Amino acid sequence: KNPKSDKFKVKRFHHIEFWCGDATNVARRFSWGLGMRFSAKSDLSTGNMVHASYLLTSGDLRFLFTAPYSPSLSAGEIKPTTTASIPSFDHGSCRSFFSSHGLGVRAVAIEVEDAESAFSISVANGAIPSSPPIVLNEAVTIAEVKLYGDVVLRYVSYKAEFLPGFERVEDASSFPLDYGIRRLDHAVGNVPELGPALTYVAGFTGFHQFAEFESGLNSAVLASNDEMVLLPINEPVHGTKRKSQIQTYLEHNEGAGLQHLALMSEDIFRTLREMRKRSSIGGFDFMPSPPPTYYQNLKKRVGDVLSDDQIKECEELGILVDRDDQGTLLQIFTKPLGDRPTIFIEIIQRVGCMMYQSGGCGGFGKGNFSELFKSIEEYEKTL
Amino acid sequence: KNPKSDKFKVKRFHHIEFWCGDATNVARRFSWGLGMRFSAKSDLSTGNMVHASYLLTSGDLRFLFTAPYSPSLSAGEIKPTTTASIPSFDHGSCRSFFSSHGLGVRAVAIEVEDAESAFSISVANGAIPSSPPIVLNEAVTIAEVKLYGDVVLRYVSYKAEFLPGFERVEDASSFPLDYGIRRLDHAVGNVPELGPALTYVAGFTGFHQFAEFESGLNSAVLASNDEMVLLPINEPVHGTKRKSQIQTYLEHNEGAGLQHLALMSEDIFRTLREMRKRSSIGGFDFMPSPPPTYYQNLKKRVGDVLSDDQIKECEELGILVDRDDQGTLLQIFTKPLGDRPTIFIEIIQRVGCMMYQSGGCGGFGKGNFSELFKSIEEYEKTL
């Protein structure tokens, strides 16, 4: 059931912004590790005396990395005379965010029909304002409201390449890396209490619950009208045996924040081959693979969707597989992206739900909990 | 003239410590860009609740990358009960350093015969104490004094692998990258006033002036007894036509600090080939190459040291060449390592002065200023 109750016209995920201490080094690591190319910049060389911002792209996926310069470079400026290309940026907020959370997502940006209207309607419906709408070069409008913790939901709207004040990156500096990643599928937050977080966000967006099919947490998913903007939220489940990874996150992050980004690949086998080749030479590490008993049980679950050769290829790369009632999902998780056990990345590919592919095809993998536990039991029995 | 006036026994450069906001991402970028392997760690997985520290090595070169965790993880601890593996570390100092300077060198560490004696003699002779000697697991002693700006000179001494509390990195996580870099040759500071900086440091070390052979700056070099620990210092020259790059550094760094690290390669052609292949895929960029007229003048200067084939190989890679009265120097400079136009790296190889090779063989390249200017004039004439 999709009531299509969006309070303003939402299009697609637009970009994710990381707040960094040094944007150069994080962006270069991510570029190599994920196969994203350098496509735009806003920094001292472009006249920005406030922040250094570097944009990576792969297909439709846009990762922005921003760090502050010394406030002394822009001490004469006021907001009317700022050289910042992102007017919501504030040195104090950025330094406070990073000292509090370390490397993490500051903004989940969605493209909307009219960012000023989205902002007004959102705040009229309970959203906590973070940055009021501002029009950039009479071309783009940007506004921000709080989402959870210190993460903001950023509205972007275009009258008619990233943002004014950003420069195209000279092709000699822009190597065409591509491991197959094509778009952001979903962005997941961790909170202390799921209920109030859901009520708040669904309250001001009109996003509806997406609805699914005991260890770790409780979650739920909010979705836009066409279910292309997907925002899951997790809360911990306390008092288990094995400590909730959601609670570990909240401790090490100093509170709520973005837990993981799920990136859709047009060929998850190629993506995982390319990323795993680079894990020990600057790229990203992946979580430990499930036991072969897990893959020794995949034939009985998705043997009609993947050949035995494709299932053995899943086993080589450590891919997990889950299944909805309309689709099938292939997924895998990285280890945390930075020093703290907080944010990580998921690589995903979905098969089914063709009409274009509808959003959320196959679910989010929650059936992999029971499957993994069964795998462990069976493997211990075979030991 | 080498008066050999060291006030305590100094051995060799031991390590350089960068203070970071996220040590993981900087260390992975540097590892790939420079061809250094991951060899030790001290972090949450080793019981360190205070800081994340990752050690990269290439030959004898040791780069340490450190970032703070949330203070809340170690809120119960006191200095007697600390889980930090580097007892001089302080969350407040590290966050203040990084917000003030961005990514940069916090410590230039030298191995000494007795770090407690070095510290006492240094402070007795004018050094400003930064961290008093502390003995780690009855095995290693570490102490720190201020060097310039917020950079410290760190003394390390061993009774008899990096530091207690650091763990060997599991070989699966430790890929054996190597582009030929083998040791730190020199470490250079930028200061507002050269005279007082020299007086202070030579005052407490007993290091002597190393002594050489109009645009940018004035410099001088302090050296240990065998001239294997080399510490150049630069000051700006004001009132030129083209603004001093030393003054630009001081502005963007918010004051004095470490300007560049010069890394000796056992094969500078292989190193530069390997680093340049990776410049646009996560590694380091190099400064623009001198005009071919420069290389069209190398035969008349070092034609007796390098064949014409080796000189054309210098031209491909953009290497500069200078010459002492005892040796010849091959060198090249990276673009700044991070967001700010502050710290960069120099790759160097020295030929001559065999007895082992004596330190500073060939000088530091200061003759390349005049040579480059002449190159520009000649190239403009040929245009």
Ligand SMILES: O=C1C(O)=C([C@H]2CC[C@H](c3ccc(Cl)cc3)CC2)C(=O)c2ccccc21
């Ligand atoms: O986005 C996700 C998501 O990524 C998982 C994940 C959690 C980890 C699970 C898992 C990972 C690895 C193994 Cl070996 C077993 C299970 C797989 C599904 C969920 O369970 C989930 C539930 C509800 C809404 C969204 C989501």
Ligand SMILES: O=C1C(O)=C([C@H]2CC[C@H](c3ccc(Cl)cc3)CC2)C(=O)c2ccccc21
């Ligand atoms: O360590 C150095 C050093 O690295 C340079 C450098 C400065 C930049 C010069 C240069 C670089 C590039 C070109 Cl195209 C021309 C000159 C080469 C020497 C010095 O001039 C110097 C002088 C005195 C003590 C130490 C040092």
Ligand SMILES: [Co+2]
């Ligand atoms: Co997910």
Ligand SMILES: [Co+2]
């Ligand atoms: Co030098």
